[PDB]
Symmetry: C3
Subunit: 279 residues, 3 copies
């Protein structure tokens, strides 16, 4: 009954922009004037190739750098390799992915599938400390053939003392209906360690956050320590075994949650009601 990922690989083309935003932040977008923080999700299947035509519309040098995926040195997007982009410039980055498989020597090649991310490597400092602070980051998902696909995917980025660069105590909030298969991509950036926590839900601490069967010994968790550039993801069944509610998620570092690193996973009945909860 559950929707499943197909095999790659297709060659895919895509435009991407970096824009400085009116409030001082910086964001990526698939369309000029539609930059967001986090940047848009890129999802591919193992084997796919992605050619990203990237345009830097800003007054400063900027780049696109990615985790996990196969790229040649000319596409790591760092200053050292002159792989970043001049103001007003355009460059085509190529990301590639591969399936797992046996090497000639008999060992097993891992394969690209997982929850990754992309970000700037050049604004502010040669490690993109400025870019990253301002919002130049976004999620990437590489699916393995056979992976369980969600109804929806949300991205939660712990960037310094903010969630998704939002002001303290301003979410983001997410909504689902009891029974929705919800996917979270959880990314951390900046200076601090954090512990991501979801009330009422839990996942497996492995590649997919799901257990394929009774033989997987991965810890089942609802809390997880994370540091800069760490990424993981998982799927849950909204309100499974617990019912509808305004379920908090937050960083569990005590002063962080006290100072606003909090949001709500709003799980609704088919009638839209949530027990407790107003606003």
């Amino acid at each position: 009954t559950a929707r499943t990922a197909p095999a790659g690989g297709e060659v895919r083309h895509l435009k991407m922009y970096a824009e400085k935003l009116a409030d001082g932040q910086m964001g990526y977008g698939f369309e000029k004037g539609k930059a967001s923080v986090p940047g848009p999700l890129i999802e591919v299947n193992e084997g796919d190739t992605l050619h990203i035509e990237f345009t830097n519309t800003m007054d400063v040098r900027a780049s696109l750098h990615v985790h996990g995926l196969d790229f040649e040195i000319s596409s790591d997007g760092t200053a050292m390799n002159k792989s970043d982009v001049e103001p007003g410039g355009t460059r085509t980055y190529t990301w590639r992915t591969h399936k797992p498989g046996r090497r000639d020597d008999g060992t097993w090649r891992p394969g690209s599938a997982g929850y990754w991310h992309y970000h700037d490597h050049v604004v502010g400092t040669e490690h993109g400390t400025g870019g990253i602070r301002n919002g130049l980051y976004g999620p990437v998902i590489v699916r393995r053939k056979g992976d369980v696909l969600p109804d929806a995917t949300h991205t939660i980025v712990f960037n310094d003392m903010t969630i998704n660069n939002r002001k303290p105590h301003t979410g983001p909030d997410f909504e689902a209906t009891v029974g929705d298969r919800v996917e979270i991509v959880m990314i951390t950036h900046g200076e601090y360690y954090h512990t991501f926590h979801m009330h009422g839900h839990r996942w497996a601490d492995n590649r997919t956050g799901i257990l394929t069967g009774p033989d997987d010994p991965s810890r089942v968790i609802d809390n997880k320590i994370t540091g800069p550039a760490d990424s993981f993801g998982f799927q849950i069944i909204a309100g499974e075994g617990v019912g509808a509610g305004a379920w908090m998620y937050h960083c569990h570092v005590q002063s962080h949650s006290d100072m606003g690193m909090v949001g709500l996973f709003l799980v609704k009945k088919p009638d839209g009601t949530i027990p407790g909860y107003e606003p």
Copy 2:
């Protein structure tokens, strides 16, 4: 020979209290005047339901909030849900648990088993920063049918710069005899990251701390980074392959151990002696 957990689920009733202590701290107990920090261990089998008649005996609002287990929103113990308890009041919290199994859609449902914990979510702040600092935390274990049961279970909580809210350099110490199966439940709370370390012993970094057989690829470790609200647990054979001794456990963050986050795992010969140890 090794005793294993049975199947649930029974419906179990329990009473619990929150008390302010003479010394300014706060603790939970199963009986009034027998509060402890950490609180008493709650251990159940997958499928069990637990109804906790909880009384807040303090002058401030307080709550019980649990990780991992199934509870409806009315039992999350947060202020927002009006799920906490007035001074002098009594509420019944329900914790449910479930076995893993196949969902209608063919996917695999995780199951409650693991090393979890409970704590206050309301004293001092809406995240229980005061509650937690003062001592309102305790361990929870949910067993899977077939899990290996220990001789004893000890709880070690790294709460800010303390172990079990104790003064620097005052343990706690634990005693065992060479050959004893010892379970540790290891929980972290507060502001800081820590690294838990035990001399002379090691465990698997998975759900149970134990490898089922030769196919489990989990790292075997004796050191592990933890943050606020992380919980894990494991079993070791006291002095297995290493003999009797005063084996330290400590946080390995250098200034933390220097400033007192240290205790002793006292493994004795059957005669009661420990090589190279006092007093």
Copy 3:
């Protein structure tokens, strides 16, 4: 065709020294006057016993303490057990290791294989805060029968705000040719949490950094949070699917990389050239 580890255990002997260095650092060596920071790599097979004749050539007390391996209390290298070594002194430390297997009771005993380390436990403080800060640390590898052996092993230690006690922005750098099987042993020490990252390469988050086959659910990563005394290790195929290049590795905690916790993994073509780069 991939070279694999044999079964132990042989009884092995080894001399090791602690020396104060001209610039005020402290290091271990296998030979007096050839001390290094990190200390030299110790590699054994499961079942091997290692007798280390350790001489302290400094004016302060010092010891050798190891993680993970089997040692009796008389070889834990701590002051409390009078297991450290007086100035000019010599002591023989014994490290044993064991294969995994079935216990009498039917459970599975874990086995020593993994990425470990050794360090001083006595210089500066009873926890070796001075020793460790000055450079008294080195790696240990214990192989399981059948483990894949690399072309080379490099040791990367994040010690406080340094890599291998080096000056900010001075590497170390490592060189390989596309296709070389490169093993990293990654160790962390001191006060700080860190986040290890390699551009262009990835590994499995398990014991060996390698997936055995398609049944292993371990997250494949290129980024990893670590704390004091954490050790892990992995194997990668240099430039696998990405080609030649000056691939950065660094701590990804933004101020850390900015302030110099950066190195280069120089993957060369057979001709010696690196696209980039250049000297």
